[PDB]
Design a protein around this ligand. Sequence first.
Ligand SMILES: Cc1cc(OCCCc2c3n(c4c(-c5c(C)nn(C)c5C)c(Cl)ccc24)CCCN(c2cc(C(=O)O)cc4c2ccn4C)C3=O)cc(C)c1Cl
Ligand SMILES: Cc1cc(OCCCc2c3n(c4c(-c5c(C)nn(C)c5C)c(Cl)ccc24)CCCN(c2cc(C(=O)O)cc4c2ccn4C)C3=O)cc(C)c1Cl
Ligand SMILES: Cc1cc(OCCCc2c3n(c4c(-c5c(C)nn(C)c5C)c(Cl)ccc24)CCCN(c2cc(C(=O)O)cc4c2ccn4C)C3=O)cc(C)c1Cl
Ligand SMILES: OC[C@H]1O[C@H](O[C@H]2[C@H](O)[C@@H](O)[C@@H](O)O[C@@H]2CO)[C@H](O)[C@@H](O)[C@@H]1O
Length: 513
Amino acid sequence: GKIEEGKLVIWINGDKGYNGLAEVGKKFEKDTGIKVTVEHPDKLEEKFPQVAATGDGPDIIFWAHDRFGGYAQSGLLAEITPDKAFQDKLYPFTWDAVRYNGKLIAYPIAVEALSLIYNKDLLPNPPKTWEEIPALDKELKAKGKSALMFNLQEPYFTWPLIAADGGYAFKYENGKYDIKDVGVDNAGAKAGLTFLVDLIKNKHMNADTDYSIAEAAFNKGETAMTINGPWAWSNIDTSKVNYGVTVLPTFKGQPSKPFVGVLSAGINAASPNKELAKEFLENYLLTDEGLEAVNKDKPLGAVALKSYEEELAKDPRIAATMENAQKGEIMPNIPQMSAFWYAVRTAVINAASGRQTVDEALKDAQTGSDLYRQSLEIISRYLREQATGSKDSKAGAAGRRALETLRRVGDGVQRNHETAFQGMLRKLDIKNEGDVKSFSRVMVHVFKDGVTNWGRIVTLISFGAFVAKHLKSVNQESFIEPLAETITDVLVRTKRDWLVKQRGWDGFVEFFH
Ligand SMILES: Cc1cc(OCCCc2c3n(c4c(-c5c(C)nn(C)c5C)c(Cl)ccc24)CCCN(c2cc(C(=O)O)cc4c2ccn4C)C3=O)cc(C)c1Cl
Ligand SMILES: Cc1cc(OCCCc2c3n(c4c(-c5c(C)nn(C)c5C)c(Cl)ccc24)CCCN(c2cc(C(=O)O)cc4c2ccn4C)C3=O)cc(C)c1Cl
Ligand SMILES: Cc1cc(OCCCc2c3n(c4c(-c5c(C)nn(C)c5C)c(Cl)ccc24)CCCN(c2cc(C(=O)O)cc4c2ccn4C)C3=O)cc(C)c1Cl
Ligand SMILES: OC[C@H]1O[C@H](O[C@H]2[C@H](O)[C@@H](O)[C@@H](O)O[C@@H]2CO)[C@H](O)[C@@H](O)[C@@H]1O
């Protein structure tokens, strides 16, 4: 393999207590003799699924729970095997955050939520609303300082305000989340994002302020407030700023609803040291001495282990985190969160800068959030419709116009290049699905380069329909839907940003109308 046997390599983000975790590994090396190396790579959430799909990466990966469900869908995680004797040591909600398809995929560590952090010496009475912030900024700017400065490069810090008046990611009726209704461009988010953009335009905040310059500004006493979670308390302690942690401001009478994260530890499915990773996580990290080693470095918040939470509950700063946690909503861990996160990440940055209006950014975020879902429905319906000859009798008329347009456009194009399609077809293996799934390699390489227009996308889907028909004739019916999956993977992973600029499939409908 590509992972060394006899040691543990752990990936944890840089804002967390990576040193405090490293001394847990020194303790792990001292009783055990096995070395434990902890690293904090940048863009960890994106680099793990890339290197783990090729069978490499760390033994243990640390991040909030929202990313693990996608990693599990991609088969990058091994099921953790804790007995109930151990499960009774952590709170049930932490276990609930690491469940996907009924199988546990990671050990929960600690519950995070954003809070308002304010300098008691620059204002001893924190404002209870967001609407009070512009006026307070004018008074302190006369004193040479600012009211609020928080990171606007990651949408995690703005979602509390966006979700205040009715914004949400994916709706949770009836048993669980539904994928079709995304709430990024509702009247609530348009109002929440507008107040932030209005704060930027009236020069009360800077649109490209990030994490480091906002933390430095607060630690120096250059701002009266900012928004971050428990991991920032450590360096505010060192700056000796008399700070407080209180509940986030309300927006339009409603509380700010922060995304609740549960940082968790998953075990790589390609790792040869899965049992030692379990022993390290069960009998060393998730113990009171082990968690205190990490919490002393950078605070975790509400620890998952019940014995250590009973000791740390008395902290007024952790109590404030639960106030914001209860008034927030838990982040889903469905595999569609990555595409949702990138959609809102671009939308906040473009609206903050003025490159897009708030309405243009949020609608494009809606297209990007449902991008993969709606694309697969149209391509899967079309390939089935060309294979059977009938029609499916299953916020849907837009797909009906796209499928009817794809019927009219795909039929003519498919018979235009019909000779070339069969010459390309003439070969064909099609022995198993692994070979049909192996068409992902060829298609992504040919499609990353070259012209991007609707004509190419139609030609891509039309040959897929051409293969689907032949799949039905060679009695390979079950291979049609996996073929559609492959086409949808290739299409969106290469042309996502183009398809968003073209109104999603609405631009496909108008292009041919
Ligand atoms: C208030 C509290 C929080 C806490 O915290 C321990 C850390 C984990 C935690 C729990 N709770 C949380 C809530 C939270 C709250 C609050 N309301 N709502 C709607 C949510 C989502 C939020 Cl917002 C954030 C974190 C938690 C839910 C209730 C208590 N509990 C739970 C605790 C137990 C138990 O007694 O062992 C059994 C539980 C749950 C949840 C389901 N079951 C079966 C949890 O597992 C720990 C304690 C002791 C107490 Cl008294
Ligand atoms: C529509 C269709 C597509 C298609 O193709 C199957 C999909 C991918 C495919 C492969 N090869 C291709 C070459 C190719 C060849 C030959 N030489 N060179 C220089 C290239 C670029 C061309 Cl020109 C076009 C497509 C492919 C590369 C070598 C073999 N192989 C590979 C094969 C193996 C393996 O079996 O061991 C491992 C491989 C690769 C590529 C990377 N790895 C690890 C492929 O994955 C095949 C047919 C019959 C049809 Cl009908
Ligand atoms: C393995 C697999 C692959 C796949 O891939 C679908 C990708 C679409 C594709 C293209 N081409 C194809 C040819 C083809 C060949 C070879 N010769 N000739 C004459 C044709 C028509 C065949 Cl036989 C089948 C599919 C294609 C080459 C020319 C058109 N073109 C195009 C390429 C360019 C460009 O390079 O810039 C611009 C183009 C077009 C078409 C319009 N414009 C503007 C393409 O991108 C789909 C599936 C389901 C599977 Cl399973
Ligand atoms: O901003 C999008 C980003 O939000 C969350 O990332 C948080 C992380 O969970 C926190 O523990 C801390 O590291 O701050 C991050 C934001 O900078 C999600 O976990 C992540 O998936 C998403 O991309």
